[PDB]
Amino acid sequence: IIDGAPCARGSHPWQVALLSGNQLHCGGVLVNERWVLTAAHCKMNEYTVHLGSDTLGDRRAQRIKASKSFRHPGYSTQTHVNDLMLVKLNSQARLSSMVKKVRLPSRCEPPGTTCTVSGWGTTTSPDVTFPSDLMCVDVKLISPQDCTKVYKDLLENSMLCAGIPDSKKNACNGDSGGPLVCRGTLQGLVSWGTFPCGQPNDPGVYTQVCKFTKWINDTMKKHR
Numbered sequence: 001i002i003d004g005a006p007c008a009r010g011s012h013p014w015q016v017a018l019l020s021g022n023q024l025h026c027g028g029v030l031v032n033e034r035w036v037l038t039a040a041h042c043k044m045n046e047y048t049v050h051l052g053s054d055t056l057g058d059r060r061a062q063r064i065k066a067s068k069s070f071r072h073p074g075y076s077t078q079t080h081v082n083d084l085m086l087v088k089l090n091s092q093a094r095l096s097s098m099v100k101k102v103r104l105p106s107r108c109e110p111p112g113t114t115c116t117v118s119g120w121g122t123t124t125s126p127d128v129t130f131p132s133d134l135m136c137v138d139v140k141l142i143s144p145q146d147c148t149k150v151y152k153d154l155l156e157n158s159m160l161c162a163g164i165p166d167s168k169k170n171a172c173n174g175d176s177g178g179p180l181v182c183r184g185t186l187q188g189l190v191s192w193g194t195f196p197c198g199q200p201n202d203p204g205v206y207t208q209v210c211k212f213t214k215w216i217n218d219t220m221k222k223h224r
């Protein structure tokens with residue numbers, strides 16, 4: 001997260017991290033005791049999932065191995081359309097005041113809504129700096145018509161743009177798959193942006209969760 005501040009302690013109990021061993025790979029969100037939602041571009045053969053602490057690296061965090069994951073069938077490794085994936089935990093997450101299921105949306109929040117995006121990704125770019133504490137920034141949803149002016153053919157329908165005018169506040173490497181929450185529901189998963197991160201007036205681009213709830217539910221049903 002570029003130009004953020006630590007998230008409020010205990011306010012992100014549905015945030016997880018996907019690790020390669022104990023190295024950050026991506027963010028994610030806990031959907032239920034057996035499933036994490038993240039970005040398809042974060043696909044690996046196996047993952048370690050961190051839950052239950054705002055401190056990445058916390059010796060007391062819950063850690064669960066995950067062997068199985070399923071990208072949206074429409075995902076492209078070229079364009080990153082449909083950048084979402086479900087990761088199946090090998091054992092059930094232990095829920096508590098610090099480990100909670102995210103609230104998936106019924107509806108799509110409109111342009112101009114204020115939202116919060118979180119993650120443990122780099123706070124600097126191109127030279128990286130990885131934080132210990134979960135970082136947050138508030139960003140506003142940008143309409144497709146406005147966002148197309150910037151990204152043109154790179155933007156496809158189920159991508160949602162968000163940012164703050166003239167601001168570096170944004171997502172960056174290591175934040176993918178983490179949550180963009182607006183008015184109490186999960187509206188986005190971090191997907192992509194420009195490089196170096198934090199260029200003013202280059203929106204962050206998110207998978208628009210309100211377009212994928214049938215696939216999310218159907219896939220979880222199918223796999224257990």
Ligand SMILES: *C[C@@](*)(O)[C@H](Cc1ccccc1)NC(=O)[C@@H]1CCCN1C(=O)[C@H](C)NC(=O)[C@H](C)NC(=O)CCC(=O)O
Pocket residue numbers: 025026039041042080121154171172173174175176177190191192193194195196197204
């Ligand atoms: C995987 C996830 O952690 C990461 C999150 C992220 C968010 C914002 C900025 C950078 C990274 N997502 C990515 O790494 C995605 C998926 C692979 C490629 N990718 C990108 O966001 C890359 C960095 N974006 C680009 O290549 C964009 C489309 N082009 C440019 O940035 C060109 C130059 C420019 O205008 O500055």
